[PDB]
């Protein structure tokens, strides 16, 4: 898509490369409650961690966006130390007033279920959540599915998953979606996630979703 160079994308590779006791501290959810600052994240049965999958996949997304002239910033800068709380990741995104926010995750579900789901804030708390973020979720879902990655068989509908319990989505004031790429407990998704080429496969599809949404906003 044209007229996307110079637009701003905030990238959030879920979880931290290391955790301490401060991840249990309570932070606001955006709907009047609190939850833990951070969670360790899930892992494959044999211990490949979500935080490394999201980190490396996000680096691949960033490189492709840079090649398109798209500005990026990331919520964390390594995969071996503490990272920001879930409310802080939303605050970092909001401080940038970006055109798009993508948080990248991997899920833990029943081992026979595989595929992606795209989460978005619902019920919406502001205009970005009510309109553009819903459109972004659909474009992202379409591009993941067009890439041959099946929509999740075990949660959501057709790969879309309206959610009220994600602090980073609730607190965003700019277009924002969270991509659960697959189920780390499933043999196919875990094998893809453990491979550099599989992580590139997820990244390429996410980039198509981002670029398609950015182009639609122009
Ligand atoms: Zn996660």
Numbering used by the authors: 37 to 254
Q: Which of the paper's sentences describe this entry?
A:
Ami1Mab shares 68% and 65% primary sequence identity with Ami1Msm and Ami1Mtb, respectively, while Ami1Msm and Ami1Mtb possess 79% identity. MSMEG_6281 (Ami1Msm), containing an amidase_3 domain, is dispensable for bacterial growth but ami1 deletion mutants present an atypical lateral branching and a defect in cell separation and septal PG turnover. This mutant is also more susceptible to antibiotics due to increased cell wall permeability; a phenotype subsequently confirmed in an independent study which also reported the attenuation of the virulence the ami1 mutant in a mouse model of infection. While cell division was impaired in the ami1Msm knockout strain, this phenotype could be rescued by complementation with the orthologue gene, Rv3717, from M. tuberculosis (ami1Mtb), suggesting a similar mode of action in both species. In M. smegmatis, deletion of ami1 increases type 3-3 crosslinks as compared to the WT strain.
PG remodeling is performed by numerous autolysins acting on specific substrates and at different stages during bacterial growth. While glycosidases, such as muraminidases and glucosaminidases act to hydrolyze the glycosidic bonds between the carbohydrate units, peptidases, such as N-acetylmuramyl-l-alanine amidases, l,d-endopeptidases, d,l-endopeptidases, l,d-carboxypeptidases, and dd-carboxypeptidases, hydrolyze the amide bonds of the peptide stem at specific positions.
